[PDB]
């Protein structure tokens, strides 16, 4: 289909004793395929989907070396930022980085991104042109000048349009059986009486992949927003996702209400009615 590859990196400082906790994960679309956890035994980049396991010893060696180096970069960053923000060495702080690339239906480059946060706020981000930096404050401005001088955006732009995109296609091919398959939502409605004159209708979508989905209610063919509730999309735990939407209605008027389900795995939207 249309696709992405993303890496996520988090370090949390441990004042008091030792090195930060570091956790890295890699995704193709909504599927985790690798992980590294500084608390685990292996001290290696580890496989998390069947299709990555066939990569040879030099892949695992390379990805291990790169992720451990990343962990050391984060550790130095936590020290530098404590200085920039004139902060005590007694408190715990966080650094986060995400990067990756999207391709369209034709598996060609659509966009790239590379962004950094300190203590959960935007710090520095590569702009969409993959040439410029957005710096949120004057600390980030210092970092922007440093990365200009080290040709960082040049290197990022080359990875994101090149290696990122080339390896994403490779994974898409090797993991075809799951990665290029769409699992349409299994849908149903439940009914929960609240009194002798009102009831809750709940429209369910289960076991779907990818996570993107839209659930909407209508009354007499018009969009309804009053008296509705929509929960956040959530993992089933087996690689698929779940979501529901609910509306409170006058008992006996259930028919007037319809639930509408849009998903990439569905040729045309579904309509459910009680």
């Amino acid at each position: 289909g249309s696709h992405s590859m993303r890496y996520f990196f988090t370090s949390v400082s441990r004042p008091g004793r030792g090195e930060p906790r570091f956790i890295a994960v890699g995704y193709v679309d909504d599927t985790q395929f690798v992980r590294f956890d500084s608390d685990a035994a292996s001290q290696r980049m580890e496989p998390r989907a069947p299709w990555i396991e066939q990569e040879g010893p030099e892949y695992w060696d390379g990805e291990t070396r790169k992720v451990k180096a990343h962990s050391q970069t984060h550790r130095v960053d936590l020290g530098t930022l404590r200085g920039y923000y004139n902060q005590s060495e007694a408190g715990s702080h966080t650094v986060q980085r995400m990067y990756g690339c999207d391709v369209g239906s034709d598996w060609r480059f659509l966009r790239g991104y590379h962004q950094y946060a300190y203590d959960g706020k935007d710090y520095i981000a590569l702009k969409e042109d993959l040439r410029s930096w957005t710096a949120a404050d004057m600390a980030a401005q210092t970092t922007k000048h440093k990365w200009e001088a080290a040709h960082v955006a040049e290197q990022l732009r080359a990875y994101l349009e090149g290696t990122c995109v080339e390896w994403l296609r490779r994974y898409l091919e090797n993991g075809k059986e799951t990665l290029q398959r769409t699992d349409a939502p299994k849908t149903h409605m439940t009914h929960h009486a609240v009194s002798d004159h009102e009831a809750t209708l709940r429209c369910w979508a289960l076991s779907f992949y990818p996570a993107e989905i839209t659930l909407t209610w209508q009354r007499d063919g018009e969009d309804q927003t009053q008296d509705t509730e929509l929960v956040e999309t959530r993992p089933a735990g087996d690689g698929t996702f779940q979501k529901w939407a609910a509306v409170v209605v006058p008992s006996g008027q259930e028919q007037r209400y319809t639930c509408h389900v849009q998903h990439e795995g569905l040729p045309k939207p579904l309509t459910l009615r009680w």
Binding site: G26, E63, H70, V76, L81, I124, V152, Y159, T163, W167
Partner: peptide, 9 residues
């Protein structure tokens, strides 16, 4: 595959 690049703030 990760980016072959290693930089600090």
């Amino acid at each position: 595959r990760q980016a072959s690049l290693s930089i600090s703030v």
